[PDB]
Specification:
194 residues; alpha/beta; Rossmann fold; 5-stranded parallel sheet; binds guanosine-5'-monophosphate; GK/Ca_channel_bsu; Guanylate_kin-like_dom; cytoplasm; ATP binding; acetylation
Amino acid sequence: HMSGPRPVVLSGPSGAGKSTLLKRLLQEHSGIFGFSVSHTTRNPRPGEENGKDYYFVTREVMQRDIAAGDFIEHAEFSGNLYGTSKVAVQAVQAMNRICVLDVDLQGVRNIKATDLRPIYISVQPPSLHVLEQRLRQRNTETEESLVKRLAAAQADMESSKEPGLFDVVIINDSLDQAYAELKEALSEEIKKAQ
Ligand SMILES: Nc1nc2c(ncn2[C@@H]2O[C@H](COP(=O)(O)O)[C@@H](O)[C@H]2O)c(=O)[nH]1
């Protein structure tokens, strides 16, 4: 489906701000934006909600839907499978809202190969050291997973400066400042939706 407004792809390292900032945007501008609820095979963290943060399913279940052609894209990340189902994006487009997707670098490249034509925004930590401190606070990962995640985060930070990859790269040192910059990047789309 190409109808409805242009979507928005948010990326950057997990834990560096993209998810928190998106939740804030969806609260302030709930009539304008809708979130694409990805499927994942990883286990839920405390406070996450099925059908809101992710559809939490097993590998077997996700594999059946993949085999059926139900996904726009999918990726392996730190031992688990993640993906954007067709229906997740279509549900938001049907409400005539701006669909926001939160994906890793592989998902950015996956979506670049589709016909969705989104705006791409990367949310970066001030440093890998700061990101590591934040990840170890909630401590939701095994050490093996944290090692894979920190390597992926480093690769993400290195690719963030690639010419033409992202429309805007936001450095999240302060959530209030980064949130202002997220809306700045979307300000024309927000005004047109209004
Ligand atoms: N390619 C892709 N990545 C996703 C999807 N959903 C979440 N991710 C990404 O997977 C990484 C790990 O997410 P986390 O396990 O920390 O929630 C993050 O970069 C997140 O944006 C998806 O549908 N597709």
